[PDB]
UniProtKB/Swiss-Prot annotation:
Effect of residue 118 to K/R: Strongly reduced CO(2) hydrase and p-nitrophenyl acetate esterase activities
Effect in UniProt of substituting residue 103 to A/Q: Strongly reduced CO(2) hydrase activity
Result after altering residue 59 to L: Reduced activity
Family indicated by similarity: Belongs to the alpha-carbonic anhydrase family.
Effect seen on changing residue 4 to H: Reduced proton transfer rate
Phenotypic consequence of residue 116 to E: Strongly reduced activity
One GO process term, biological-process aspect: regulation of intracellular pH
Outcome of substituting residue 118 to A/G/I/L/S: Reduced CO(2) hydrase and p-nitrophenyl acetate esterase activities
Protein name: Carbonic anhydrase 2
Active site, UniProt feature: 61 (proton donor/acceptor)
Co-factor requirement: Zn(2+); Co(2+)
Enzyme Commission code(s) on record: 4.2.1.1, 4.2.1.69
Length: 257
């Protein structure tokens, strides 16, 4: 089964998921001087006021917080998107050291971590159908740099000791994802894929220009999670990121000059 190690990591994934060598794979390097400002791009509309978080889970490749997506409670609209996209979950990718961990890069710069807020297009009825469509998902990506603490992250950080190993989950109600957003919603956008298997080419990526700052203590708690299940030899959950993939016949657009 796939992972991030020497023998099952990103360079091997194409054997079980041949789309890994496809025409619209993610992540990519964002060359800021080559991205084109698109004045027809609308501001992002993030409506998270009624979000209902449910659970937090260690799935063996990251940890994720899941939301009730059975109604339009937390939705993303506008920007490059047509229609309404419901928030399903968020998760992170991070490194073993502060100089790596993000999936997207900016002028080849890697951030310490990357937050992905995953949304699906309500016209397709459920996320399983949406993943089969070229415009099925919208992922909002937010970079994390290490500096001052992010208060809105602390409730996540403080529960991680209860989901140390693969398969563990915990109740995680009343979490407000608005506390994870930077001040500015300026963004880059391009058509891409899931960054983990099945690597489906169904994602409109929206990557925010402004990172959030988290403290060294906060990211250190991410690095104490385990890839392995309970009772197995311990392998710290670090460096769970896919490297940048070829841009091929794609242009990255910017919402800002
Ligand atoms: N990192 S991402 O591009 O935001 C992303 C967003 C939503 C997703 O569903 C996945 N992929 C996933 O969760 N795979 C789980 C194992 C099942 C494969 O058989 C990746
Ligand atoms: Zn992700």
């Amino acid at each position: 089964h796939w992972g991030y190690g020497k023998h099952n990591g990103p360079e091997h994934w194409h054997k079980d998921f041949p789309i890994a060598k496809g025409e619209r794979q993610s992540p990519v390097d964002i060359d800021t001087h080559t991205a084109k400002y698109d004045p027809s791009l609308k501001p992002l509309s993030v409506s998270y006021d009624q979000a209902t978080s449910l659970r937090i889970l260690n799935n063996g490749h990251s940890f994720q917080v899941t939301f009730d997506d059975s109604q339009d409670k937390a939705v993303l609209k506008g920007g490059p998107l047509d229609g309404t996209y419901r928030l399903l979950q968020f998760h992170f990718h991070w490194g073993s050291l502060d100089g790596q961990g993000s999936e997207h890069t900016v002028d080849k710069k890697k951030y310490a971590a990357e937050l992905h807020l995953v949304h699906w297009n309500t016209k397709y009825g459920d996320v399983g159908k949406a993943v089969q469509q070229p415009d099925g998902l919208a992922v909002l990506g937010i970079f994390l740099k290490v500096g001052s603490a992010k208060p809105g992250l602390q409730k996540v950080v403080d529960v991680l000791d209860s989901i140390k190993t693969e398969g563990k989950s915990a109740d995680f109600t009343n979490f407000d994802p608005r506390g994870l957003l930077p001040e500015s919603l300026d963004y880059w956008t391009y058509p891409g894929s899931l960054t983990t298997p099945p690597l489906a080419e169904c994602v409109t990526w929206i990557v925010l220009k402004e990172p959030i700052s988290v403290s060294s203590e906060q990211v250190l708690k991410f690095r104490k999670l385990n890839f392995n299940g309970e009772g197995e030899p311990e392998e710290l959950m670090v460096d769970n990121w896919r490297p940048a993939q070829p841009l091929k016949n794609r242009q990255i657009k910017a919402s800002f000059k």
